[PDB]
Design an enzyme around this catalytic site. Structure first.
Site, PDB file in Angstrom:
ATOM      1  N   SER A 105       0.689  -1.226  -0.004  1.00 40.08           N
ATOM      2  CA  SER A 105       0.095  -0.120   0.034  1.00 40.08           C
ATOM      3  C   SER A 105       0.666   1.326  -0.047  1.00 40.08           C
ATOM      4  CB  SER A 105      -0.697  -0.004   1.064  1.00 40.08           C
ATOM      5  OG  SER A 105      -1.732   1.076   1.052  1.00 40.08           O
ATOM      6  N   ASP A 187      -9.268  -4.027  -6.421  1.00 41.75           N
ATOM      7  CA  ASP A 187      -8.982  -3.231  -5.196  1.00 41.75           C
ATOM      8  C   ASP A 187      -9.978  -2.301  -4.821  1.00 41.75           C
ATOM      9  OD1 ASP A 187      -7.655  -1.646  -3.453  1.00 41.75           O
ATOM     10  OD2 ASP A 187      -5.690  -2.059  -4.124  1.00 41.75           O
ATOM     11  N   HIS A 224      -7.242  -5.426  -1.839  1.00 41.06           N
ATOM     12  CA  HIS A 224      -6.192  -4.601  -1.869  1.00 41.06           C
ATOM     13  C   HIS A 224      -5.177  -5.504  -0.617  1.00 41.06           C
ATOM     14  CE1 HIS A 224      -3.944  -0.995  -1.233  1.00 41.06           C
ATOM     15  NE2 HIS A 224      -3.784  -0.856   0.042  1.00 41.06           N
TER      16      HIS A 224
END
EC number: 3.1.1.3
Lengths: 317, 317
Positions: A105, A187, A224
């Site tokens: 991330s 995502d 994600h």
């Protein structure tokens, strides 16, 4: 990309040192060290102990990580100071050896941020493996921003933010070290990630850009979190880390390697911890700092986002 | 199963009225109505207008919804008062006819909660289609709860909560009307949902319980949002709304309906909106109310959770 001396840290070295930990050794006295940069709302261990902390020693690395407080929610520029100081401490600590960097991330955005604006580390980073990095931010931060309950880094990870603007305008959307970008169209945190091109938030020019739906087809869903932990994500990671180029190769992965559920070399307890990676993160965010404006850019990056609006007002030259 | 009188509302009659709305019709004039109860941290429109509000119209029903203030984060008992006043409305306002009820997340729990403790509405609800419902709550609310940053309903949607406890002990884990429950094992909000059996938070006794992996295989990934939005979810939802036996069955859906992405019948805009259903919801929670205890159970439900602790203390006779 910018050049000259490295800009001064806003933190003392000792404060930056305390954010760095290696599993098995001292940071400044280690060998075969990999650097792990955690996601938004997590510490190093919280992000990686259920996945890449064990999996990196399964490949002969001493796992190391930063844990910029608080839970990566503070200024991304400060978060980067931890990464820059880590690589400078880990270089000499492992006998002036270039070391790989694995990220989740925001960790990716942090990596490229340091690489762009801190030149001295470019010759010290062997390569970069970024999972679901948000180099262009995400439009999905909009509602959080609109309610003025966004943390410093959440503001900065919004598409069109002053930080992301600065990164693009300084050339940071082109890879600086050999880079592998594993991500996904499904995502739910970072978008746009769909077009499988440079429009995507995870795409860096000249870097290995792996969107999962391009190697496992339109139907393949990984979120994600899965983007970091899944068995698919492991083969790509294993590739990138071991390669002679610095990037993952298409030779090492394919539909046989397309496994959405958590990695296979994880204990059944680790598979559950990885499957629930987002929950502690979400809790940290709800409980973390919040403000109604994007943090001011530091002088080194400030001129790259003239016109944008941070806490002090409209960025000016 | 309890009976006798309906519990006295804590919310004013008129207050509860403002929560209900239909696409085109008055509360009193509605025809072929379906009641939609939204997820946690959302309104009716937020939860559904990108998915089931437009799916219902094509099917034939006049879509309706409640939107309890604030964003379904208040007491689930009070959230239910909205659905009870609504079923009394859509019944009398459809000329004394039964009406279907379709729900997401906490929506299911709320429905089953009203069905359990409000006799009058048991006669007025045609069927119940619930997507990723959490009748046993979730364990993933724990970190939030541990940080004392959980909204009233977030405490209540926690596994072991006085509310989920009371629900089981008043015979609320058995379907009170004909009921279908579609859910995923990869659901990242509600767990456990993996055993494909009565352990799952979505399972009701005698209800049609569909787990997505029990047909699409242990590699089919849809998350808590997917459970409501996917094309797969459209087929199963349609089936149940079309069945004369009140619920869906395996003849209407198969391996070719294993479509995790949003419903094919939705516009490209709606398919993008539906994919991002979670982002507003998360933002609502971050900005929403927070407390350090589970709300007290109202006197009608309080005896079914003796031993549990709520804001006022431990429950006793």
């Amino acid at each position: 990309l910018p050049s000259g001396s490295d800009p001064a840290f806003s933190q003392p070295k000792s404060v930056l040192d305390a954010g760095l930990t290696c599993q098995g050794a001292s940071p400044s006295s280690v060998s075969k060290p990999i650097l792990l940069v955690p996601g938004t709302g997590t510490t190093g261990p919280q992000s990686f102990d259920s996945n890449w902390i064990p999996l990196s020693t399964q490949l002969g690395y001493t796992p190391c990580w930063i844990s910029p407080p608080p839970f990566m929610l503070n200024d991304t520029q400060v978060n980067t100071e931890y990464m820059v100081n880590a690589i400078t401490a880990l270089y000499a600590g492992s006998g002036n050896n270039k070391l790989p960097v694995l990220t989740w991330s925001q960790g990716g955005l942090v990596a490229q941020w340091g690489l762009t604006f801190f030149p001295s580390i470019r010759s010290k980073v062997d390569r970069l493996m970024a999972f679901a990095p948000d180099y262009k931010g995400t439009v999905l931060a909009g509602p959080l921003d609109a309610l003025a309950v966004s943390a410093p880094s959440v503001w900065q990870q919004t598409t069109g933010s002053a930080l992301t603007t600065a990164l693009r305008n300084a050339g940071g959307l082109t890879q600086i070290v050999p880079t592998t970008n594993l991500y996904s169209a499904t995502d739910e945190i970072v978008q746009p990630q769909v077009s499988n091109s440079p429009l995507d938030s995870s795409y860096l020019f000249n870097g290995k850009n792996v969107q999962a739906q391009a190697v496992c087809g339109p139907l393949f869903v990984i979120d994600h979190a899965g983007s970091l932990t899944s068995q698919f994500s492991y083969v790509v990671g294993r590739s990138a880390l071991r390669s002679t180029t610095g990037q993952a190769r298409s030779a090492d992965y394919g539909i046989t390697d397309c496994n959405p559920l958590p990695a296979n070399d994880l204990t059944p307890e680790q598979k559950v911890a990885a499957a629930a990676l987002l929950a502690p993160a979400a809790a940290a965010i709800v409980a973390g700092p919040k403000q109604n404006c994007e943090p001011d850019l530091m002088p080194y990056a400030r001129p790259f986002a003239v016109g944008k609006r941070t806490c002090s007002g409209i960025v000016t030259p």
